[PDB]
Amino acid sequence: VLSAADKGNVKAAWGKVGGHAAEYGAEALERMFLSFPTTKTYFPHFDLSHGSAQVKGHGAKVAAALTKAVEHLDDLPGALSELSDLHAHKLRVDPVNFKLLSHSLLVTLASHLPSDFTPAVHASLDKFLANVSTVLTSKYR
Amino acid sequence: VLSAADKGNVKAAWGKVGGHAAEYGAEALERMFLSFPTTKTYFPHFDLSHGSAQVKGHGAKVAAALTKAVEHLDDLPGALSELSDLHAHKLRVDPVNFKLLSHSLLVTLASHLPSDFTPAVHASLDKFLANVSTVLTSKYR
Amino acid sequence: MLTAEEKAAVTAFWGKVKVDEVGGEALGRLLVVYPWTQRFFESFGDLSTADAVMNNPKVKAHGKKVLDSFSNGMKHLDDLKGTFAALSELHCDKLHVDPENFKLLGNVLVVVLARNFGKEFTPVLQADFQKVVAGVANALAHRYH
Amino acid sequence: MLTAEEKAAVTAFWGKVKVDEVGGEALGRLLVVYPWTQRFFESFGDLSTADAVMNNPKVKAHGKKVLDSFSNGMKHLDDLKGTFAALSELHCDKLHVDPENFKLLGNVLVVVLARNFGKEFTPVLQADFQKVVAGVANALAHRYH
Ligand code: HEM
Numbered sequence: 001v002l003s004a005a006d007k008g009n010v011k012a013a014w015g016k017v018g019g020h021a022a023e024y025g026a027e028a029l030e031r032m033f034l035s036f037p038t039t040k041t042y043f044p045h046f047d048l049s050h051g052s053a054q055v056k057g058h059g060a061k062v063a064a065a066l067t068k069a070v071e072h073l074d075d076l077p078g079a080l081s082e083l084s085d086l087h088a089h090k091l092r093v094d095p096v097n098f099k100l101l102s103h104s105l106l107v108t109l110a111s112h113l114p115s116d117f118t119p120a121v122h123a124s125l126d127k128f129l130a131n132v133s134t135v136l137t138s139k140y141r
Numbered sequence: 142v143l144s145a146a147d148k149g150n151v152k153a154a155w156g157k158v159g160g161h162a163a164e165y166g167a168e169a170l171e172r173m174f175l176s177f178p179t180t181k182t183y184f185p186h187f188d189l190s191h192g193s194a195q196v197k198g199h200g201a202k203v204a205a206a207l208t209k210a211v212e213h214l215d216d217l218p219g220a221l222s223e224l225s226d227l228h229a230h231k232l233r234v235d236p237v238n239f240k241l242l243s244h245s246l247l248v249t250l251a252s253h254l255p256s257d258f259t260p261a262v263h264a265s266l267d268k269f270l271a272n273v274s275t276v277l278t279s280k281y282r
Numbered sequence: 283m284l285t286a287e288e289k290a291a292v293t294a295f296w297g298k299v300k301v302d303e304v305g306g307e308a309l310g311r312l313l314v315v316y317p318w319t320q321r322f323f324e325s326f327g328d329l330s331t332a333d334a335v336m337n338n339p340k341v342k343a344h345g346k347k348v349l350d351s352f353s354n355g356m357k358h359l360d361d362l363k364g365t366f367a368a369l370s371e372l373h374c375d376k377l378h379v380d381p382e383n384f385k386l387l388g389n390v391l392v393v394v395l396a397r398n399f400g401k402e403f404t405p406v407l408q409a410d411f412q413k414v415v416a417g418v419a420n421a422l423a424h425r426y427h
Numbered sequence: 428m429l430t431a432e433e434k435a436a437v438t439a440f441w442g443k444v445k446v447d448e449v450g451g452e453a454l455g456r457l458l459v460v461y462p463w464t465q466r467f468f469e470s471f472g473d474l475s476t477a478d479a480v481m482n483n484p485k486v487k488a489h490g491k492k493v494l495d496s497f498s499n500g501m502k503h504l505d506d507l508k509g510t511f512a513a514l515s516e517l518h519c520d521k522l523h524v525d526p527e528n529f530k531l532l533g534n535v536l537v538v539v540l541a542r543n544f545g546k547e548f549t550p551v552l553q554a555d556f557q558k559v560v561a562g563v564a565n566a567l568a569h570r571y572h
């Protein structure tokens with residue numbers, strides 16, 4: 001679904017993210033949990049306080065999966081195969097939650113990359129996260 | 142994406158629609174307009190009264206597009222190419238409205254095929270319509 | 283919400299129809315068509331296939347209750363907010379149900395009414411029911427606002 | 428709406444918001460990121476590219492109005508309903524804007540606050556703003572209920 005221009009925008013933006021991917025993943029989760037506290041209920045045995053090593057560790061894993069997606073924009077369903085089973089079929093995550101995390105990631109990226117986060121780049125990243133979200137919610141069946 | 146099972150369910154259900162496709166497309170539009178008055182503002186050039194020739198003629202066109210899609214379940218994006226540009230670029234249809242028409246089509250099909258509209262078939266058709274909707278909203282440009 | 287005419291229409295229809303299996307069919311369909319909703323009903327037992335869901339006795343029993351609640355709403359259309367205030371707290375604060383799902387269930391119920399009730403469930407009557415289910419969903423979501 | 432101390436926190440931060448940039452940027456971003464919203468602004472001139480939208484004086488000017496409206500609700504956090512009355516009838520009864528788009532604009536404004544304020548727009552502060560924009564959206568949508 002991403003256009004050529006979208007794919008370029010996403011790759012360049014993720015490029016600027018650089019070695020800060022895990023840090024931003026952790027910030028996005030933190031923002032999601034604080035702004036939308038119901039999301040915490042998917043992580044019942046986590047300590048989700050600010051600076052929790054579990055939020056930091058989980059942030060890193062979410063960021064890595066996003067990096068894998070960025071490297072595989074032509075086949076998101078295949079790149080995200082295992083994760084889609086995990087979130088849709090195993091964990092039954094309500095599709096709303098992906099919107100909440102996607103928005104939390106846009107917030108985090110706009111904060112840290114204000115000179116790269118143009119309207120055009122915001123729209124491409126929005127589409128990319130919606131596309132990742134579609135894949136991750138495709139195996140409820 | 143549609144599983145092979147879903148595509149079987151969709152083709153079989155549309156087979157049951159038989160010669161009633163155009164009639165059901167018209168009824169689904171009427172149910173959409175009546176239930177969700179806000180959708181009427183996309184057709185200010187229509188007489189929207191019950192039984193109007195314009196709604197009847199539009200119903201047939203909607204139905205024929207769905208029939209085309211049913212015949213092209215392995216490649217929806219390809220099949221619905223021109224309609225996607227039209228709905229997204231020209232008509233600027235708010236994505237919410239696709240869910241309203243899709244729900245309207247499910248009410249219509251349920252009403253007329255109450256023996257064929259099993260929970261599995263319902264779930265297949267719902268996916269089919271969401272997918273069609275995804276496609277018709279897949280390039281605001 | 284509803285005009286007097288719309289209330290009378292809804293009320294007359296609801297008076298005549300035999301609805302004792304409708305709730306269970308609506309709940310069953312929700313869990314089949316939108317399977318994330320299964321998360322909320324782990325205690326209900328076998329939900330592993332469409333058939334298992336639809337024939338699950340707990341789903342059927344709980345659905346009857348849900349419809350009983352909907353019928354309560356139908357008797358107090360003037361006060362949906364008051365009617366569902368407690369249930370809103372339970373569903374949002376304790377059960378953590380995203381309010382979009384209240385809309386999904388109202389719409390599944392309409393689909394079910396249409397499947398069960400044929401030509402009497404006209405576009406005009408269905409639109410009246412859409413107002414009722416939108417009202418119930420807004421009233422349930424209330425503790426979110 | 429918010430706690431008294433949450434209100435204090437939001438009030439303090441809002442003071443820093445530049446009254447004539449942020450609104451134009453949020454409105455502009457809404458039209459670029461969610462292009463169907465352009466249907467509502469046919470009189471506004473060229474909206475055909477991202478640069479055209481963002482540099483369109485009518486967008487900037489209208490965005491200022493939107494922001495001044497947010498600024499207004501920021502002073503009436505415990506009664507958003509009445510504050511957004513005239514606007515709720517404009518947007519719902521006259522313009523027929525689907526209420527989903529209220530949530531979207533609220534969320535764009537929060538992204539815009541983040542881009543412009545960076546590390547100062549902390550998770551906790553942003554959480555307060557999420558409550559505020561949800562309040563505004565709910566207030567604006569009231570005429571649909
Ligand atoms: C961009 C969207 C998302 C991505 C890329 C993503 C990625 C991941 C990854 C890589 C894992 C670890 C999988 C493993 O251990 O093998 C994971 C686990 C998990 N995810 Fe997500 N996720 C996303 C959205 C969400 C959302 C929205 C929720 C719910 C609010 C969620 C809930 C969970 C939970 C509960 C786990 C397991 C945590 C545990 O170990 O107990 N995820 N996700």
Ligand code: HEM
Nearest residue numbers: 180183184199202203206207224232234238239242273274
């Ligand atoms: C399943 C989803 C839909 C399908 C398959 C569909 C199909 C079609 C078709 C075949 C046409 C005629 C194109 C032509 O002239 O050849 C059309 C036009 C149009 N559609 Fe849709 N449509 C869908 C959803 C929607 C929705 C949700 C809306 C908004 C409420 C909408 C608004 C319109 C409008 C305003 C036109 C121009 C009609 C005219 O002037 O005659 N469509 N669509």
Ligand code: HEM
Nearest residue numbers: 319322323325347348351352373377379383384387388418
């Ligand atoms: C029209 C909308 C709804 C109405 C009127 C409604 C009504 C009710 C009622 C009356 C009960 C209590 C039944 C009893 O006494 O045992 C209940 C419980 C429950 N509801 Fe709903 N509900 C609605 C929507 C939803 C939705 C959409 C979900 C989740 C997807 C949900 C999840 C639950 C759960 C998990 C319980 C507790 C079941 C248990 O005891 O294990 N409800 N609801």
Ligand code: HEM
Nearest residue numbers: 464467468492493496497522524528529530532533563564
């Ligand atoms: C969510 C928060 C929103 C706020 C606070 C807001 C605020 C305003 C304000 C202050 C006005 C000026 C009205 C007057 O002078 O009487 C206005 C007008 C308008 N708004 Fe919004 N609005 C919001 C959402 C939206 C959205 C999401 C859309 C479209 C997608 C929209 C479309 C319009 C339109 C089309 C006008 C009339 C513009 C014109 O032609 O002059 N509004 N709004």
